Structures are given as C-alpha cells and as structure tokens.
C-alpha cells in the first residue's frame, strides 16, 4: 500500500481513541429510551460535528507488514501472503500445514 | 430507513443554512453537498442546489418532498439510451 494510505489508518486509529468516550456518551443519549426529544436531537447534531475519522467503522484492517487492505487475518494481523511466508519459516508459533 | 427512535437525519451545516435563509427571507439557491439530508417542512419554497457529483442541481422544495432525502432529486448517472 502507498505510504499515504498507511498514514490515513494511523490517523483514524488515533482519532477513534481520542473521541471514543465522547462518541459513546452521545450515542448512549441518542439510544436512551427515556431521553428527551431535545436531548436526543442535540446529541444527533453533536455526533456529526466530530471528525468522521473518529468513527471506528472508518478503519480498514491492513496487513501490518505490507499495508494490504484485502486478505487480512485478524489472528495474525497479516495478509494471507505474509502469513504464508511467516508460517513456512516457523515464525508463527504452533502453526503448521493441516490435513484431516 | 433510519430508525424512528433516532429521528430524521439532517446535516447541521444545512439545518443552519436553511434557518438563516428562512429568517432572512433570502431566495438565492442554497448550495449543498448534503444529499443525505432529509427534507424538512421549513425547506418548503426554498431552492436547494444539490450536488450530483459534478454540478449543483436546483431542487425547488415542495410539500410532497418532505421526508425524502435531497439526493433523491439530483440523479448522479447520465443515461440517454444505448440506441441513440
């Protein structure tokens, strides 16, 4: 992946962490059953003023070695390609070729 | 559609722009990129120029449009037929 694309992900992770508590607060009001209509409305308006990149759903899992945005495996934090290279060198503990 | 419990979505920047146009009685088209915003009753009689990807399409808001999204009135794809 381009250097810029890897830097966008770092920015998104950092903003999501910076605003996690505030976003959770606002969304708790918007979801709150016994919240007032005005308080719900104000929360809806406030939530959209926060940076879009503070939403966790903006993050794309990328291979931690290459930045590849497809073929990710969460267990390893790597794409399918880098998993295989690491696996065959014995660098992934316990992982071996499976037959059954 | 958006859960009724959350209310209708509108972009805050558009809401404030609409409020100012209504209070002023200003009749110049409101330029917006907020295709996702719901049309509200207080938009009736305004011209909202809605982005379609390359131009702002003037949408004269009527009472029947209330509750629709602005993007519904600004088609994004150009098609005139294959055999034409």
């Amino acid at each position: 992946a381009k250097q810029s694309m890897k830097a966008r992900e770092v920015k998104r992770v950092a903003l999501a962490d910076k605003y996690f508590a505030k976003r959770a607060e606002l969304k708790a009001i918007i979801s709150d059953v016994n919240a007032s209509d005005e308080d719900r409305w104000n929360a809806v308006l406030k939530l959209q003023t926060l940076p879009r990149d503070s939403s966790p759903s903006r993050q794309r899992n990328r291979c931690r070695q290459t930045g590849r945005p497809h073929g990710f495996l969460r267990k390893f934090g790597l794409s399918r390609i880098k998993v295989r290279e690491a696996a065959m060198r014995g660098e992934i503990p316990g992982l071996k070729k499976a037959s059954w | 559609p958006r859960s009724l419990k959350k209310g209708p979505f509108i972009d805050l920047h558009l809401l404030k722009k609409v409020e100012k146009a209504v209070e002023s009685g200003d009749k110049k088209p409101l330029r917006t990129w907020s295709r996702r915003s719901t049309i509200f009753p207080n938009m009736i009689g305004l011209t909202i120029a809605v982005h379609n990807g390359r131009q702002h399409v003037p949408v004269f808001v009527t009472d029947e449009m209330v509750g629709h999204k602005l993007g519904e009135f600004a088609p994004t794809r150009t098609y005139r037929g294959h055999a034409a």
């Binding site: 209509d37 | 209310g7 009753p41 449009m65 509750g67």
Partner: peptide
C-alpha cells in the same frame, strides 16, 4: 399528507 406524516412520526 407528507408534512403531517413528517411532524407526527418525529419531534424536536
């Protein structure tokens, strides 16, 4: 129709 549809299913 639509304006009273709107004003009754929602509220500020």
């Amino acid at each position: 129709g639509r304006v009273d549809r709107f004003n009754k299913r929602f509220n500020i």
